[PDB]
């Protein structure tokens with residue numbers, strides 16, 4: 001039951017996410033360092049990116065260009081999360097409208113949790129591990145673009161202190177997506193039931209994987225609550241950008257995610 005449950009989730013996680021925390025940590029211990037405008041330019045000229053630069057919206061400025069690259073990665077991680085979720089039998093058993101509801105309100109929490117895997121206190125990996133953008137450079141962007149980034153590093157460094165591996169994260173992320181609290185859900189009892197099974201699997205798994213860790217399971221439950229507050233603040237900053245940065249393009253999928261959030 002729960003052992004094979006977890007194992008199926010773990011394989012779904014390995015199957016659908018290109019960058020795993022294992023791969024990321026090895027690199028973070030070399031990548032081209034982006035820390036100013038010149039190295040950013042060189043990086044765009046020199047590094048392979050998943051989305052091609054001319055494919056981005058028309059250029060406006062440096063801070064906005066960075067934002068577009070963040071937005072590109074966000075949308076790509078949504079696609080991965082969707083296929084990850086669909087690789088879970090109980091998720092695909094849900095009516096398609098409930099699937100969309102869970103992803104809509106779940107993906108950003110899952111993204112910011114997984115983000116910690118490619119983050120340290122000095123910056124984060126970009127371009128599939130080919131580059132490393134410094135936290136200080138991201139801090140130097142003009143508001144509101146620098147403001148929307150720093151809160152994630154703060155969460156990330158604290159989160160990495162728990163020292164989860166990929167197998168723990170697969171269950172953690174599954175639990176975030178299969179959440180019975182999401183607005184507009186049709187079959188709440190069914191999602192609550194799946195959520196409960198995942199959380200049992202998570203505890204079972206952590207007992208085995210981290211036998212000497214103390215209070216880790218309730219600590220992770222608190223991280224789930226923390227991520228909700230993080231995403232609320234994020235959505236508020238995105239609404240601010242929408243209203244005060246009219247020249248900045250917003251990806252339509254992300255726009256569909258944000259119109260009913262406060």
Ligand SMILES: O=C(O)CCCCCOc1ccccc1CN(C(=O)c1ccc(-c2cccc(F)c2)cc1)C1CC1
Nearest residue numbers: 066069070071073074111115126133148149152238254
């Ligand atoms: O939510 C939206 O509406 C999309 C909008 C998000 C905006 C805030 O995004 C971030 C905030 C904090 C940390 C990371 C991200 C974005 N992410 C990245 O992986 C990422 C970070 C930096 C760069 C990059 C690339 C080139 C130059 C440069 F200076 C930076 C590329 C990708 C993770 C969440 C997807």
Ligand SMILES: CCCCCCCO[C@@H]1O[C@H](CO)[C@@H](O)[C@H](O)[C@H]1O
Nearest residue numbers: 094095096097098099100101102184
């Ligand atoms: C797969 C069976 C066909 C599903 C048809 C039901 C569509 O319902 C719609 O689901 C959306 C969430 O996904 C909500 O945002 C809309 O308010 C709601 O009207």
